[PDB]
Design a protein that fits this description.
Order of helices and strands of chain C: HHHHHHHHHHHHHHHHHH
Shape of chain C: elongated
Radius of gyration of chain B: 23 Å
Subunit structure (chain B): Component of a heterotrimeric complex containing IMP3, IMP4 and MPP10. Interacts with MPP10. Component of the ribosomal small subunit (SSU) processome composed of at least 40 protein subunits and snoRNA U3.
Largest sheet of chain B: 3 strands, antiparallel
Structural class of chain B: mainly alpha
Strand content of chain B: under 5%
Protein name (chain B): U3 small nucleolar ribonucleoprotein protein IMP3
Structural class of chain C: mainly alpha
Number of strands of chain C: 0
Oligomer: part of a larger assembly
Number of helices of chain C: 18
Function (chain B): Required for the early cleavages at sites A0, A1 and A2 during 18S ribosomal pre-RNA processing.
Chains: A mainly alpha (about 80), B mainly alpha (about 180), C mainly alpha (about 375)
Keywords (chain B): Nucleus, Ribonucleoprotein, Ribosome biogenesis, RNA-binding, rRNA processing, rRNA-binding
Radius of gyration of chain C: 31 Å
Helix content of chain C: over 70%
Strand order of the largest sheet of chain B: 2-1-3
Strand content of chain C: under 5%
Helix content of chain B: 40-55%
Main location (chain B): nucleus
Distance between the termini of chain C: 86 Å
Number of strands of chain B: 3
Number of helices of chain B: 9
Chain lengths: ~80, ~180, ~375
RNA sequence: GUCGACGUACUUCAUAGGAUCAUUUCUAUAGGAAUCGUCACUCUUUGACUCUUCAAAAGAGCCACUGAAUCCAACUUGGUUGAU
RNA sequence: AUCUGUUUGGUGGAACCUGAUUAGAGGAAACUCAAAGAGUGCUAUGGUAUGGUGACGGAGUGCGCUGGUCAAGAGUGUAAAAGCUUUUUGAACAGAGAGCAUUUCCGGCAGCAGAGAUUUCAGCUGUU
RNA sequence: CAUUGGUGAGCAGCGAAGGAUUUGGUGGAUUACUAGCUAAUAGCAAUCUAUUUCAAAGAAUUCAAACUUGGGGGAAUGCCUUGUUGA
């Protein structure tokens, strides 16, 4: 019964209210307010980057998995 | 239905096969059990009549208070319902919304009247005595239990003559006169 | 559920049977209705071992019908398909499930073992060993299972090392049972007799040792006497002296029956084995003198030695000198014993000599038979 | 004098801390405890049936045929050498 | 005793008040029918179902695996040692059924012979 | 004394090979008599269905359609109505 329930949840995880119930957690108020502050700040950086991409004809698109790296000693 | 387990009740909080919100608490069944109402639609016909009374009272209330029309019609309605016996008093206007119930009308039915007159020990006994032909209201025999008794008409609710019940009570008091037929 | 799973496992066999000309689909449906009944009875509550036996019988008769149908229609002894081994696999699986559920039914264990031995070519010695391992762990105090294990390993595989190890472990678990000691002695005597006859076969094809003597069986005999006496005392534990005398009498019967086994073993040195057992009984046991404690058994042992001095030799080829030596030993024993004991021993010796020689040969036929009749009259 | 002002006397108005229940998961808390296709037995509660008391009352009614029960009469058997 | 009238136990139960209840309150019968509750009993046992779809099995061999012993090496220690450790290797021995591979053989036929419970069983000799 | 109390034991009288209560079932009547079945101007009743299908005729609210609601306040989202936006 438990295995069937897990496979069925995995199959229908993509549905709206199944996703709505599944993603719900009670989160502390400090963490929630800091999440919405970081969301607003990320949106502000997104509009600034959109303005920069509008200004510059050819800007490089850097990957999220590339952004954190300043450098490496041995080049590839 | 068996008793739900704890995890089942949480997923089945709204489930109930015997009590629905449209049943309104089975108030109709409660009132018919109290006053031995046989017909199923009697409560709802009485409820429609009570609804007419309450709608008219609400409209009279929305009229301005120092209105001769409002005062005259409220006193007319209070006097009419008191004369029928639905209202016990004529003191308050607010009884036209608070004290008009189906049970107030059902207390004016013939078996409840007989049980209050001590003619029968229970309302069900009074019902059976009515259907068995023992009861007259004036000269007229009434075998309908649903017959509604007015305050004036209470004074002529009596046993029929040649009734075994009437002979029994006279024989108990040792006052049976066979010339009068008892 | 489990019934549904087992039926779906039965499905590919019926796929194969329908694919060949053997069975009609409706016939398959009737067979699966019976199997549904049997699998439900096995996997439900309230089952018995008789349900397993009935299901095995049904599958056996299904296999017989399949064999007849394969002979008749396709004219081939067996197809190369799934269906010829699948019923056998199912019967083995029913046996395995039944033995796992009710391990206490020794008849069902025997039926399992007999079936797996009978289908010899398809089965494995590993499978028979595993069934023996499970059964011997579940019933270690059943002597017959140890004996059957050793017997299977001795006749089928001729594995004398495994037979010796089985007998030793079984006697470790059952040291009080005389039967397992007897079977161990019989196995060891069989092994040394086979070795002797194998050496003789080599000696006739082409162109000593305590193993060939029998000292292994003699050591098993001695350890048998000590262990059986100790455990008999532990089971039944002036009155202690009476109990010790009863224990000695009890051990004497097993010793005499070992003597009978030795007499059955003609190829071995019967005189050597009887000499050893009478040497042991001449040695005192249970802190009491043997002859003083059991004079009847002492006279019986003396008469047994005197008779078995010549009883190995035939009456037809009997030696007069050996008979005279036996009579002299009997006279010495009669002189040593009491007068009533001497009379009883003389009567027993006369009866034994009569049944040996006097009925076999006539006094007119043999000149020495007249001397034997004179000696019997003297006795 | 159902008049005011002042004086006096009296009447009535507080509030918190914690927990649980209430969303067809979640009442906002991670300090909590519940996810399984039935086989049988035992006990308990409830309601139907049939009969009935307190304790009556009313009979969809009349004829005909055919069963049954009960009480007397009569006959039979047992019984003062003892029925009930 | 046409003596006395308190007590104790039955019978009876009006008035007031108080509490509860209300299609008036019960009772009897059962291998009856129905709706539920509680507690027991019962191997009640797939943590990934069986030894197999000739896509297979059995026998054998090779490899692997297991155990202790012996030898060698290494590390440690020592004035030399002894002792101790070893995820080091080799050899002999005893195994397990528990893995892997097989381009070995057998699950065709004929015949001989033996054994078991008239049939069956493996085996041998031929052949395919 | 009375008993319009109960339970009994007995007479007169009545009185034809018995009498008295109780109860189950079935039939007739309880309105005023013109026969069964069907696809019905006829056929069947033992059915037929192995002629049972063709042709003809046949389409309004240009879907009108809760006359069907206990009373007082409401209506997030439904539903109804109206307006609007984009196709």
């Amino acid at each position: 019964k438990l295995e069937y329930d897990e496979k069925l949840k995995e199959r229908f995880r993509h549905m709206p209210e199944i996703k709505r119930i599944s993603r719900h957690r009670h989160v502390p108020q400090v963490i929630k307010k800091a999440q919405e502050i970081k969301n607003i700040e990320l949106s502000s950086i997104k509009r600034r980057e959109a303005n920069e991409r509008r200004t510059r004809k050819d800007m490089p698109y850097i990957s999220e998995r590339k952004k954190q790296i300043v450098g490496t000693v041995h080049k590839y | 239905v068996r008793k739900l387990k704890h995890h089942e009740q949480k997923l089945l909080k709204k489930v109930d096969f015997l009590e629905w919100k449209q049943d309104q608490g089975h108030r109709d069944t409660q009132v018919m059990r109290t006053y031995h109402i046989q017909n199923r639609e009697d409560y709802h016909k009485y409820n429609r009549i009570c609804g007419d009374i309450r709608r008219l009272a609400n409209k009279l209330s929305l009229l301005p208070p120092t209105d001769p029309f409002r005062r005259k019609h409220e006193q007319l309605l209070l006097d009419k319902l008191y004369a029928m016996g639905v209202l016990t008093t004529k003191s308050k206007i607010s009884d036209l919304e608070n004290k008009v119930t189906v049970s107030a009308i059902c207390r004016r039915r013939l078996p409840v009247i007989m049980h209050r007159l001590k003619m029968a020990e229970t309302i069900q006994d009074a019902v059976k005595f009515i259907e068995q032909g023992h009861v007259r209201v004036g000269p007229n025999l009434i075998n309908d239990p649903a017959y509604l008794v007015t305050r004036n008409m209470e004074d002529y609710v009596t046993w029929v003559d040649n009734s075994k019940i009437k002979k029994t009570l006279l024989r108990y008091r040792n006052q049976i006169d066979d010339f009068d037929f008892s | 559920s489990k019934t549904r799973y087992y039926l779906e496992q039965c499905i590919p066999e019926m796929d194969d049977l329908v694919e060949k000309g053997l069975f009609t689909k409706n016939e398959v449906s009737l067979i699966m209705k019976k199997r549904t009944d049997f699998e439900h009875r096995l996997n439900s509550r309230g089952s018995s071992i008789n349900d397993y036996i009935k299901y095995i019988n049904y599958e056996s008769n299904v296999n017989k019908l399949r064999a007849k149908r394969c002979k008749r229609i396709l004219q081939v002894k067996k197809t190369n398909s799934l269906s010829d081994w699948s019923i056998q696999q199912r019967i083995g699986f029913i046996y395995q499930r039944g033995t796992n559920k009710f391990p206490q039914d020794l008849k069902f264990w025997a039926m399992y073992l007999n079936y797996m031995k009978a289908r010899g070519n398809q089965t494995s010695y590993k499978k028979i060993h595993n069934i023996y391992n499970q059964l011997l762990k579940l019933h270690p105090t059943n002597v017959d299972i140890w004996i059957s294990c050793a017997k299977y390993e001795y006749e089928v595989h001729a594995n004398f090392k495994s037979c010796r190890n089985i007998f030793q472990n079984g006697l470790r678990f059952n040291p009080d049972v005389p039967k397992l000691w007897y079977e161990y002695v019989k196995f060891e005597l069989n092994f040394i007799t086979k070795l002797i006859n194998r050496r003789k076969v080599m000696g006739l094809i082409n162109e000593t040792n305590p193993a060939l003597r029998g000292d292994i069986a003699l050591t098993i005999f001695d350890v048998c006497m000590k262990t059986l006496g100790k455990h008999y005392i532990n089971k039944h534990k002036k009155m202690n002296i009476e109990l010790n005398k009863e224990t000695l009498n009890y051990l004497f019967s097993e010793s005499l029956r070992y003597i009978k086994l030795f007499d059955e073993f003609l190829d071995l040195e019967r005189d050597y084995l009887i000499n050893h057992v009478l040497q042991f009984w001449k040695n005192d046991m249970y802190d009491l003198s043997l002859r003083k404690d059991l004079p009847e058994l002492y006279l019986k042992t003396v008469m047994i030695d005197i008779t078995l001095n010549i009883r190995y030799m035939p009456v037809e080829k009997l030696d007069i000198d050996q008979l005279q030596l036996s009579v002299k030993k009997y006279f010495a024993y009669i002189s040593k014993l009491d007068s009533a004991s001497v009379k009883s021993l003389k009567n027993e010796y006369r009866s034994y000599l009569q049944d040996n020689y006097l009925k076999k040969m006539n006094a007119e036929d043999d000149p020495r038979y007249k001397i034997l009749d004179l000696i019997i009259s003297k006795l």
